[PDB]
Amino acid sequence: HMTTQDELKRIAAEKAVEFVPENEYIGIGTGSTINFFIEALGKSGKKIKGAVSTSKKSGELLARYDIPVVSLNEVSGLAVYIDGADEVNHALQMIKGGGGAHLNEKIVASASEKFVCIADESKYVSRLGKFPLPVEAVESARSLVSRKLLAMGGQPELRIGYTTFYGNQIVDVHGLNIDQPLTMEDEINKITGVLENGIFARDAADVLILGTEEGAKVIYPCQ
Ligand code: NA
């Protein structure tokens, strides 16, 4: 039978354990692929000095698997950040935030010395953009941010009924042409009322572990 998507996620998560140094502070992403990774890291027996969480769920699983959790404010930096992606291109630039956590994810990534992305094969794309782009905005700026995103060219859609970790809203933007991921990352963030967007170009991954039918493939940015 074909390997299921969950099995592909587990393949990538299990391989990523090998990338985690012992006795260091590390950062932990969010999502279903990460949830398999937290379990695998706990089962490995590796000594972890402390882990910084990016979501309520990730923090709960770290505790379930006996991995010590620390606030980002307690450390001067992290040795490695491990996280998933909704899309990842050949330069290892990513679209993130399908699960609502892109603000905390980018904060923790930006404090880390290395970013390991874990994903099943379906996330690896030639061009970023098909997956709608999450944008976090404060509630009173919803209509304003939406007009500004529409003027940029995308179709803004409020994520109905959703409240982010820090109490804000997400507008998901459909149909963007992303010529230059770093330029668009910065231009969207210049909209007043936007707190963060899901383009990870400045914080592109350093290495990608991709779960495929042939096992876990290790992929560095294209030359
Ligand atoms: Na997310």
UniProtKB/Swiss-Prot annotation:
Per the record, its GO cellular-component terms are: cytosol
The protein's matches in SUPFAM superfamilies, at most eight in alphabetical order, are given as: D-ribose-5-phosphate isomerase (RpiA), lid domain, NagB/RpiA/CoA transferase-like
| Location of the active site | E105
Which EC number(s) does UniProt give? 5.3.1.6
Q: Gene3D superfamilies in the record, alphabetically?
A: 3.30.70.260, 3.40.50.1360
> Which positions make up the signal peptide?
none
The record's section on Pfam families has: Rib_5-P_isom_A
Q: Which CDD domains match?
A: RPI_A
| Top-level taxon | Bacteria
Stored InterPro entries? NagB/RpiA_transferase-like, Ribose5P_isomerase_typA_subgr, Ribose5P_isomerase_type_A
Q: Which catalytic reaction applies to this protein?
A: aldehydo-D-ribose 5-phosphate = D-ribulose 5-phosphate
Keyword Isomerase found: yes
What keywords were assigned to this record?
Isomerase
Q: Name one GO biological process term.
A: D-ribose metabolic process
GO molecular function terms attached to this record: ribose-5-phosphate isomerase activity
Could you confirm whether the keyword Isomerase appears in this record?
A: yes
Summarize where substrate binds, as residue positions.
T30, G31, S32, T33, D83, G84, A85, D86, K96, G97, G98, G99, K123
What role is this protein assigned?
Answer: Catalyzes the reversible conversion of ribose-5-phosphate to ribulose 5-phosphate.
Subunit field text: Homodimer.
Known HAMAP family for this protein?
Rib_5P_isom_A (MF_00170)
PANTHER family in alphabetical order: RIBOSE-5-PHOSPHATE ISOMERASE (PTHR11934:SF0)
Similarity field: Belongs to the ribose 5-phosphate isomerase family.
What protein name is recorded for this chain? Ribose-5-phosphate isomerase A
**Taxonomic lineage of the native organism:** Bacteria, Pseudomonadati, Pseudomonadota, Betaproteobacteria, Neisseriales
